[PDB]
Structure formats: structure tokens, C-alpha cells
Design a protein around this ligand. Structure first.
Ligand SMILES: [Ca+2]
Ligand SMILES: [Ca+2]
Ligand SMILES: [Zn+2]
Ligand SMILES: [Zn+2]
Ligand SMILES: [Zn+2]
Ligand SMILES: [Zn+2]
Lengths: 232, 265, 265, 252, 48
DNA sequence: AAACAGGGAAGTAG
DNA sequence: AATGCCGCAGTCGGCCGACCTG
DNA sequence: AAACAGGGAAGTAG
DNA sequence: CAGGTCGGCCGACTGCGGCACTCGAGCTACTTCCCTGTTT
DNA sequence: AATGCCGCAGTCGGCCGACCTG
């Protein structure tokens, strides 16, 4: 528990990250993060790519952001411009960081629709065509704020990307890294009787199912008689 | 046409037949339209899906739960232990209820029936303490907690509670007994050695007789986990609402309701 | 043999199968032995015996009862009036509930449906006062009180309460409404003119359309009052759990469940 | 029978046609009964409605009465409201839909409440065309004024018994009388014309002879027949009446 | 696992596509549309 | 001065 | 006077039309 | 001095 | 007299409903009757 | 670990033995 406090002092991960790392109570992790003064389909298929403006970096205020739509794996770099050369280098490093995507969705930026980009994607055999990437921008700037002594904005962004990808935690205990390199059903609350959902189905079989709602720390096992599909 | 039906259902939340008749579409399309509506209520009236496991041999799997017989006064905490296979039942009327009373009931039931191999119960705090778990582990008896707030997991012992309460009412109206222990002993005697089934077999001799059966039939089987009618497979045991098929490749026998069993010729 | 069986049952209150197997007697004898025992419990699980009357023409017989929709606040006293034949339903959300509110609901329902000939209700004090009885007698509308504590007598209006509550839940989740009156009006509109049955007939056009049917079939009929299968008789209407045979000599049509109707060829 | 008609007119004030069609009364007798009272001096249904807001002095606070008139069958619905605002008009629209159903075109006046964006959007959402009828030609206005006059006359007629707890109760009573009681010259109530069972005669309708009075009473609808007996269903009866075929006369 | 799932909203047997889970007589089919998986009754599922 | 043992409180199932 | 029900939904099955075949 | 009209109590159904 | 018919009987089956740790408190609404302030 | 049931009782029906009959 004591080591979790200094780990948060160093990285400022989420309470879920702290609890899964250090085997502590959800209440303990929530108290730690509250007390922290700095804390107020298949992968590689469809991507979203965008550039953001972060004035705190000075000349490097232009940060391009690329996020997987399934694993939410996040990559970003800061450069002096949003020109075609910068976007090309961002695509190269995004490949180096996350592999081969199938389809990439971008905005209507002139550099993004530039011919050199079209033949780039044509030669690397990737087709070309938005709230998730915006939420990614918000998460990136939040982590950058929380990380505030570093040498370069590149160093700071490397720290932020590492935290968000390999430290920051969702409920299911799988980091963005496992999700990048590794079903909703109605369920009736058997105690109160009110129907709840939609929630993700973890495992089912032989008259019972395992349902893990996002608002519960532990999975809920319910009889098969009270399971209905969502089918969005 | 389909878009018009979806818009109309979103506006009014009609019935499937209404959309089918008004918009000239197939019945399945209307049913799925009414199903996909987020505001439409979930189907509470679900058919029989799950079935509780049973033992294929006497003294393999037991269920156990407590009840309340207020006519006993301080001895209202009646404990019931049932063998799932032969429906052999044992009961004790013990004042209070705690780890001590549960351990005493377990010892007396073992004296009355013998060693079980798995004991299923509800998720009561008494059956969770390290005392009872340590006792069961020491005696090499597996324990299954079961889903909370789900009496259907202990449906067998609940039905046995019904039978025991009925028998106690009958014998209490029959005459007079000195102590609740005497009445409970008489009721257990009747239910076990006298309350014979329709096949001419008492519960006692079912719990303590040889296992014999005719060549088990072969039946089409619907595996709910794969959703395909796969067979034929040997049907070990069957009854009202339960079935136990044993496929050759299966690691353990599979318990499925009667609706998923189809005769094969 | 019979005396020994009676003595044994008096001593232990065994099962019928137990006596049949042990004393070598017929099954009927054992069943009657266990039945005649005064201490044996009465058969609570009785099958379907009674069926509530229905009207063979629209605007003949109605049922009516109140409910509680707490989401309305002060307007929770929802009144429901149902025509038994076509299942045409009308509802009002009126604050409070008394003779005044019942009279207002009756007037609005008459404006919505028309003159009924018999109105069945429960035995609530509101439907008993001389005010409502005088109003009904003045309007020439027969009233049937019904057995107290027996919702099965108003089973039709209770099922309509279920349907209305479901429709109100659906429409409330669908969007927002200014007043409970608006939501109730929308729900009634859907249920009456939109919620079409499986035969392509809305409730409104069933309540207000011509009466037509195929040549009614002839079915064997078990008269419970005489206990003999007498027939054949013309079956006027039939459905799930209800039937209405009209014998030639009968003064009025007889309502019997489906178990007492046997097809005749 | 005549005294029963007199009591029925005293309770509900209808025209002589309804009394003579419901109680088998002769023309002059029914008209004389009507005169005795102290205060009695489109092509397809659910296609084209019409609306307007009138004022009644009797209600006082609920003087705003919204009336929805079907152009074909004259099926009339009215509601008393505290105002003519958009919310009140929308609630009246919803209640009119509950009372009748879905029409094709709803003609209205040039009042700002109808032209308001909320009402037009609501009507477009329900796939209901709205015709403003900005040329103030008194044809639809004439018919809606006729219906307003009928409503006012019915309210005046029913005001004999000052026992109406609320104006809603009185308006409901008047609407009930006008719709389900007042019959046309051909013998059809407003509901019968509005809901369209009057298209043909697809059922065998047969004359019947009664035994209690010994007079041919009918004609009525035939349910079934057999073994010398016929199952005729009288309009006013509670249950079908078995009738021998000797007392059954086919009617065309 | 490749299956033939019937898009009974249109009546076409779209496929092939992967199958995620199954149960309740429903097969949780995941088509190329990665937005959300869909459940289809097993009566309308044909293994490929 | 942080730790150990009642006592109470809190949470969960029956 | 004086009485279970009926909608949601899964399922069985026969009828009719397009497809495979001797 | 027995009777009539609130007011309260009691009983019954929902 | 041996085949068709009817009666006894038990195998198979289904309608049903409460087991669930246990039970009460309460409000609205109406009618009917007795106590008490008020009448002739 | 993690799943409705089964006894009470009414009922359908086929099998076997006694009775009616051409
Ligand atoms: Ca328990
Ligand atoms: Ca009631
Ligand atoms: Zn922090
Ligand atoms: Zn819906
Ligand atoms: Zn007995
Ligand atoms: Zn008059």
C-alpha cells in the first residue's frame, strides 16, 4: 500500500491501475488519487489520426495523435508543424509503434489529403477515408498536466504515452498493451429485481453467466434465466 | 419500408403484428424491430433454461439449508440435508443456529447417511466461516457456495422443506408428541422408510441399494454452448425437467432440461 | 386388508403408493384412503375450474377497477374500464378517488365507448354507495358486485392493468410528456387504434365492427352441474382457457374452461 | 314504451329519430315527446378533420373549448382547456387522436398556436399533413361553426340537471349524447358512420318472432341454426335467444 | 469459426464472419462492422 | 511511537 | 351478484415456390 | 322525555 | 363356442404452486350505529 | 463455485380377463 503512494507520486496513474498493481482496496486507491494534488472488433483494423495544439511545448506545440479504435492504444509526437513531411514522419513512427492498420480515418486537413500522403498510403497498402480521438486528446493533455522536471517535451510525452498505454487501467485488468496485442447482454439484478444493462458478458455456460458491469469492482454471476441480448 | 417501420415503432412502440400488417413485412422482421427497441421491456417470462446438478450415485452430492418451524418455539431452526440422487432426507431441530449447530447437524447427518463427496448449500454466513470450511476440507468434502439470492440452486432442498413441513403438519395433527425431536424423528422415519415411491422403492433402499438400469436410450441433444443439435448421446438419467447426457468426448456429464432432449430412432 | 391399511395410515399417514405396494390393494383404494384422512392437507393445487363471463356483443359487459401509478404523483389513482368482448380499454388519471371521481370516469368512458348493458367491478366501497347505484339504475346499467378478495373475477381488467402499465412504461421511456393526461391519452391511442391483434383487427374496429364468424363447431360438453358429457352443442366463442357453449334447452349460454370441451366428429 | 322514451329523453336530450329508432316509436309521437321538453325548440372517415377554439360563458375559467370535427361522419370531440397555448393545443391533439385515431389532413385556422413550430413539427412527425387553409372561405369554417352551435345547444339542453361536478363531466356527457345517441335519418349513430361497418350486409340478417308478446320483433342477426331451432341475437338482448324455425321468417 | 448468419432484418445470409460466443439459442456473431456484436437465433446459423 | 487486542461499526447473506 | 388471463416470445409444422436431378 | 342531527367509533373492502 | 365388447387396473403424464430467514403496518373510502349537544 | 422442483391428484390410454353374441 505504501509503495502504491510513491508509484502514484511518480506516474499518477488511475486508482484501478494502483489497485491492480499493488493488491489494495478500491476505496484505498480512490482515497490515494483524491489526496493526490496532481489528480483533480480486433486491433490494428480501424484508426483515427489527428493533430492537436499544446502551447506549453513552445515551438513543438503541434502534437499529432493516433489512436486505435478497438484497444484505445495511444501514440503521439510533437513537431514544429503539421506539414506533409511532419504527417509522413508521424505515420512512419505510428507504424513503428503500433503495427499495420487496415483503415485510417482522418480529418479534412490539406496535408492529410495531400497527394504525397495518398501515394504513401497506396504504397503501404492502407485505405484512406471522431469523438474517440477527441477524448484521446483530452486524456493526453490531462496526463501531460498531471506529469507536471523533465528534459524535453519528447521525454515528457514518452512518459505520458507509457503511463497511458502500460500503466493506466480499464476495469477488466488488461492494459492498452494487452488489448492491442491480445458482447453486451441485459442482466436482471437478482437482489432488487430491476433490470440493468447494457453490460459486457465475460464468460457463460451451463445455466449461468459472468457479467462484469463497469460500475462494479467484482464480476457478477447471474442465472441464465435472467440474460437478454442487447444487439445494438 | 423497413425504415418507415423503425420510425413508426420509435414514435409509438407498436406491436409486432401491427407493423407486420400495416407495412407488409415478414413476421420475423417485425419481431426483431420490436426486440431492438431500447425502451421496450425485457422478457421477464423466460422459459426453463437451467437445471441444478444431481449425483449419479448415492452419497455423492448433497444440498442443505435451514427453515423455520415456529411451532417448535426455541427449536424453530430446523436443519435439512438431502441427497440429490435418492432424495434421502435427514432433519434436526436445533435451538439457535451457528457454526456449532451446523457442525453438530453435519455430524449427525453423517451418522445418519454417511460420507458425501460434494455438499452444495446456499451462501449463508454460517457455511462460509473458516471453521466449517476447515472441517469440510479435513473430512475431504467439497463445498459449493452457490449463487446468492438464488434458491433455485437449492431447489431440491427447498422442495424437501415443503415435504418435511407437510409431514410435520400431518403428524402434529395426528396426535401429541413429547418433544419436537420425537415428532421430527417420526416424520423422518415415515418420509425415509415408509413414504414409498411409485416404483415400489423406499428412499432408504434407493440411497442404499444397487444401481441398476435398462440399456440407456440414445437421444438428440442440443448443446446450448454451441447452439447445434449434436448426437446421438447416451442419456444417463431423466425425469421431470432434467436430463443427464454423457457424450463420449465430454469430460463430465452434462445436465440439460427436458426441452433440449429429442428422441432418436 | 382394508382395515389394516386404514389403521396404518391413521398411525403414520403414509403415501398412497406405499399402502398400494405394501398391502396389495388397488390404486384407487389407496387414493381414497389417503383422501378420507381428516389430518391430511387439502388439495391447494386445484386445476382451472371457473371462468369469468364475457359479452358476445360489443358494449354488453364491462369490467372496471383502479390501480396505482406512483409516477403520476397526485394523479396516481388511475381508473380502467374494459369491454370484455373486444378488449377495448379506456383509462383516466384522476387525483383522488371517490364517488365523484368514479362518476366522472364513468361519464368519460361512456363518451369514449358508449352505453354498456352490464358493468362488473370489485366490491370496493366506492362502487357500493347509493350514489353510484342510483346513477347506474337511472342509466339502466346492471351492476355486479363480485366476490370479495377475488381478483380472478376481474381478471380481464387486471390483465388490462398489466398491459396499460407496460404501455405507460414504454411511452415514458420513449420521451417526455407535459402532463400524465397526455401520456395516458397517447398510451390509450396506441393500445386501442394501433396495437393490432394477430388477425389484422384493431381493438377499436373489434369494438365497433360487424359480428361475423364461420359456422360454429359442435363439441362434446361436460356439464359440471350434472357431471355427464352431454352434447353435441354449438360452441359460440372459444380461446385460451375459456369456452361458451349454447345448448338448445339452456336459458343462457354457459361459460366453461377448455378442459371440459372435447371436439366431436 | 312511450313512457320509457319520455324518461330517456328527460335523461339524455336527443332528437326524435334516435328515440323512434331505439324504442320503436312512431314519427309524430317521438316529435311530440321532443317538443314536450321545456328547452327543446370528404368521402371516407378518418381522412380530413378540422379544429377551432370557441368560447363558452358557462364554464367561466375553462371557456376555451377545442373541437375536432371529422368532415365525413361528423364525429365530434370537444375538450375544455385553461388556454389556447401551444401546449394546450398539443394535448387536445393527443386526446383527439386517442378518441378517433390517425387522420390524413387536419385543417385548422390561422391562429398562431397552429402555425407555431411545435405543432407543425408534431404533426409532421406523426405523418399527418396539415392544411392551414389561409383563404378564409366559410365552408370548413361553416361546418365547424355548425358543430360549435350543436355543442352549445347540447350543453344548454343538458344544463337542466345542475348536478355536473366539473365542466369536463358535462362536456363528456354532451359528447356522449351527440356521438352515441343522436342518430341520422337513416338510423346510424355518429360512431357507426365514423368507424365504417356500413359498407355492405355480409351476414344473414333474419326477421324474428317473439313468444313473450306474440309479435314479430326484429329483424335481427342470425348466429347459427340447426335441429329445427335458430339462434337469433336481438340487438337489445343480453344473450342469444333460441327460436323455432316455425317462427323464423327470412328477411332481405 | 465461420458461420452463415441470417440478417433477418433484410433476409439475406450475409457472411462469412467470426463467431464470438453462443448461448440461450443465440449466437453472438461479429461481422466486419466492428461497432458492436449482434446476437442471432441459432435457428438462423449455418456453420461454414 | 508504531503496534497489538477488544469493541464497535459497516457490509452481506439469509 | 357472487367463476383467470393474455401478451411476449420461442417453437412446431404444413403450404407454396425456387432449385437439384434421373 | 323521547327524538333529531354531528361526531366519533366500528366494521369491511380495496 | 371363439371373436368382438366392455370393465378393472396400472403405466405415463400433466395442472399447479410454494420452498425460499419472518411479518406486519397503513391509508382511503364507504356504511351503520351509539354518544352527546340540541329540539318540541 | 456460481443452473427448479416434485408431490398431490385428476386424467388418458393400452393391456388383460370376464361377458355378449352370430
Ligand atoms: Ca438458506
Ligand atoms: Ca379494486
Ligand atoms: Zn496523481
Ligand atoms: Zn419499442
Ligand atoms: Zn392421512
Ligand atoms: Zn329535451
Amino acid at each position: 500500500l505504501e509503495s502504491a503512494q510513491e508509484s502514484h507520486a511518480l506516474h499518477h496513474q488511475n486508482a484501478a491501475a494502483l489497485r491492480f498493481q499493488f493488491h489494495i482496496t478500491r476505496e484505498q486507491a480512490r482515497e490515494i488519487v483524491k489526496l493526490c494534488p496532481n489528480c483533480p472488433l480486433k486491433p490494428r483494423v480501424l484508426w483515427q489520426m489527428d493533430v492537436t495544439h499544446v502551447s506549453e511545448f513552445g515551438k513543438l506545440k503541434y502534437v499529432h495523435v493516433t489512436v486505435d479504435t478497438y484497444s484505445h492504444f495511444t501514440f503521439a509526437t510533437a513537431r514544429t508543424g503539421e506539414a506533409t513531411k511532419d504527417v509522413l514522419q508521424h505515420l512512419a513512427q505510428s507504424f513503428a509503434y503500433m503495427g499495420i492498420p487496415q483503415k485510417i480515418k482522418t480529418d479534412n486537413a490539406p496535408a492529410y489529403v495531400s497527394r504525397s500522403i495518398q501515394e504513401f498510403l497506396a504504397r503501404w497498402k492502407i485505405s484512406h477515408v471522431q469523438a474517440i480521438v477527441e477524448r484521446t486528446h483530452q486524456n493526453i493533455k490531462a496526463q501531460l498536466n498531471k506529469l507536471q522536471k523533465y528534459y524535453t517535451p519528447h521525454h515528457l510525452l514518452a512518459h505520458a504515452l507509457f503511463v497511458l498505454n502500460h500503466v493506466n487501467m480499464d476495469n477488466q485488468g488488461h492494459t492498452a498493451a494487452e488489448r492491442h496485442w491480445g458482447p453486451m447482454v441485459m442482466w436482471k439484478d437478482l437482489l432488487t429485481g430491476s433490470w440493468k444493462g447494457p453490460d459486457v458478458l465475460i464468460t457463460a455456460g451451463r445455466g449461468y453467466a459472468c457479467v462484469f458491469p463497469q460500475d462494479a469492482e467484482s464480476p457478477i454471476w447471474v442465472p441464465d434465466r435472467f440474460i437478454r441480448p442487447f444487439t445494438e | 419500408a423497413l425504415e418507415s417501420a423503425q420510425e413508426s415503432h420509435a414514435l409509438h412502440h407498436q406491436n409486432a403484428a401491427a407493423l407486420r400488417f400495416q407495412f407488409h413485412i415478414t413476421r420475423e422482421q417485425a419481431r426483431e424491430i420490436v426486440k431492438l427497441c431500447p425502451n421496450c421491456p425485457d422478457w421477464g417470462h423466460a422459459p426453463q433454461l437451467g437445471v441444478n446438478p444431481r449425483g449419479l450415485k448415492p452419497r455423492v452430492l448433497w444440498q442443505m439449508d435451514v427453515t423455520h418451524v415456529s411451532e417448535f418455539g426455541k427449536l424453530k431452526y430446523v436443519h435439512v440435508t438431502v441427497d440429490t440422487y435418492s432424495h434421502f432426507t435427514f432433519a434436526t431441530a436445533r435451538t439457535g443456529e451457528a457454526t456449532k449447530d451446523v457442525l453438530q447437524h453435519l455430524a449427525q447427518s453423517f451418522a445418519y447417511m454417511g460420507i458425501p463427496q460434494k455438499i452444495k448449500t446456499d451462501n449463508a454466513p454460517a457455511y462460509v466461516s473458516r471453521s466449517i470450511q476447515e472441517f469440510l476440507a479435513r473430512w475431504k468434502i467439497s463445498h459449493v457456495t452457490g449463487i446468492p439470492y438464488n434458491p433455485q440452486g437449492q431447489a431440491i432442498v427447498e422442495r424437501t422443506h415443503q415435504n418435511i413441513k407437510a409431514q410435520l403438519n400431518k403428524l402434529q395433527k395426528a396426535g401429541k408428541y413429547y418433544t419436537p425431536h420425537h415428532l421430527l424423528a417420526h416424520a423422518l422415519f415415515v418420509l425415509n422408510h415408509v413414504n414409498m415411491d411409485n416404483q415400489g422403492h423406499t428412499a432408504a433402499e434407493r440411497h442404499w441399494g444397487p444401481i441398476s438400469a435398462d440399456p440407456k436410450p440414445m437421444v438428440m441433444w442440443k448443446d446450448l454452448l454451441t447452439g447445434s443439435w449434436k448426437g446421438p448421446d447416451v442419456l444417463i438419467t431423466a425425469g421431470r425437467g432434467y436430463a443427464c447426457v454423457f457424450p463420449q468426448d465430454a469430460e463430465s456429464p452434462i445436465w440439460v432440461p427436458d426441452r433440449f432432449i429429442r428422441p432418436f430412432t
